[PDB]
Amino acid sequence: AVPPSLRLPVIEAAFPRQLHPYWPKLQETTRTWLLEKRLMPADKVEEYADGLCYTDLMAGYYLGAPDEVLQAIADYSAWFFVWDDRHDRDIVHGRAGAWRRLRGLLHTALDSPGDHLHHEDTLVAGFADSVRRLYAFLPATWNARFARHFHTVIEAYDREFHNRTRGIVPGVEEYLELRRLTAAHWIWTDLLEPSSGCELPDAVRKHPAYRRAALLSQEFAAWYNDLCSLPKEIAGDEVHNLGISLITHHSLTLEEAIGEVRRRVEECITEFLAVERDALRFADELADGTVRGKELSGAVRANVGNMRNWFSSVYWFHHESGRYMVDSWDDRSTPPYVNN
Numbered sequence: 001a002v003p004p005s006l007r008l009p010v011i012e013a014a015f016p017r018q019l020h021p022y023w024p025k026l027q028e029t030t031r032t033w034l035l036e037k038r039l040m041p042a043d044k045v046e047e048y049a050d051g052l053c054y055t056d057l058m059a060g061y062y063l064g065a066p067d068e069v070l071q072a073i074a075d076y077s078a079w080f081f082v083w084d085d086r087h088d089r090d091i092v093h094g095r096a097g098a099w100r101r102l103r104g105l106l107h108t109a110l111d112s113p114g115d116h117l118h119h120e121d122t123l124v125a126g127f128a129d130s131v132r133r134l135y136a137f138l139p140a141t142w143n144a145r146f147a148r149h150f151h152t153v154i155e156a157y158d159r160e161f162h163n164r165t166r167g168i169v170p171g172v173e174e175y176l177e178l179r180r181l182t183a184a185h186w187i188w189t190d191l192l193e194p195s196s197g198c199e200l201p202d203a204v205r206k207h208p209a210y211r212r213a214a215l216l217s218q219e220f221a222a223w224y225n226d227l228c229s230l231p232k233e234i235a236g237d238e239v240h241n242l243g244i245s246l247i248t249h250h251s252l253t254l255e256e257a258i259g260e261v262r263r264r265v266e267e268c269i270t271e272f273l274a275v276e277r278d279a280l281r282f283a284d285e286l287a288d289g290t291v292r293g294k295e296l297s298g299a300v301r302a303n304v305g306n307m308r309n310w311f312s313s314v315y316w317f318h319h320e321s322g323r324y325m326v327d328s329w330d331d332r333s334t335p336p337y338v339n340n
């Protein structure tokens with residue numbers, strides 16, 4: 001039963017869950033990869049990795065992906081969670097230099113991953129492995145777009161490091177802008193493309209219905225994470241959360257803030273339903289009787305289908321994953337799965 005404050009009856013009724021058939025293999029393969037790359041201690045992998053549901057989250061999202069593509073995505077996704085944990089620990093322990101050096105290595109590795117496959121920092125080596133595999137599916141133009149997007153993401157994490165060290169809580173609009181980067185909206189949007197086997201031309205992926213449907217799917221993901229992760233984040237002195245920007249800067253109570261975040265999330269869903277009709281119409285228009293048109297139509301339809309799947313995968317992930325079960329931790333400020 002989903003806690004009442006978090007429950008979204010529209011998701012439960014109108015966004016039925018899907019699961020990619022490769023999921024059982026995926027779960028074990030990513031577990032093995034976390035182990036082999038030493039991204040988590042073996043005992044924490046054993047006790048917590050499956051319960052974190054990171055592979056489940058991606059297998060409920062990129063339906064239709066080739067198994068090899070889904071594997072690279074899931075390994076990268078598990079890496080991303082461990083990176084969020086590393087960032088958090090560097091902030092909590094005041095390791096500004098370790099963070100600055102990591103920030104610089106990730107920018108460099110992102111451009112030349114094969115050069116970093118055996119880097120001394122296992123977090124950099126794990127990143128490089130997943131990124132080198134992601135760069136082997138589509139043309140270099142897609143790789144460069146992924147890289148452009150993730151450089152921006154790394155810098156947004158750097159801004160978060162400074163806000164948290166300086167005790168600054170961003171304002172609402174400042175936060176909303178920053179959250180499109182820290183949630184990595186455009187990375188997940190880029191990854192729709194190797195999942196359906198096609199780098200989309202700019203004229204297609206920048207069509208306003210495709211752009212808007214893509215944006216709303218990610219706003220939902222980010223803001224619903226804010227709603228569900230708020231208790232862990234308060235306990236951990238995290239300042240980045242739409243709710244916190246509202247408590248801090250609009251004098252809402254915790255209760256009023258949870259309500260406003262929920263209202264924003266609900267409205268995302270019904271705005272998505274409207275634009276989804278336009279995006280699927282566009283998918284239809286592309287099928288103009290030509291071979292290329294059929295290819296583009298098929299890829300856009302699959303991508304818009306997965307933009308829809310992200311809602312249900314994210315919703316259930318937050319209720320299933322150990323990552324947010326702060327009530328179960330002996331020390332609420334120190335999740336058990338993090339390297340402290």
Ligand SMILES: CC[N+](CC)(CC)Cc1ccccc1
Pocket residue numbers: 076077078080081084182183184221222225
């Ligand atoms: C809960 C999702 N997350 C975690 C750091 C924040 C919104 C981004 C993410 C999405 C998909 C894969 C890995 C990380």
Ligand SMILES: [Mg+2]
Pocket residue numbers: 084088
């Ligand atoms: Mg976090």
Ligand SMILES: [Mg+2]
Pocket residue numbers: 084182
């Ligand atoms: Mg974070």
Ligand SMILES: [Mg+2]
Pocket residue numbers: 225226229230233
């Ligand atoms: Mg969060």
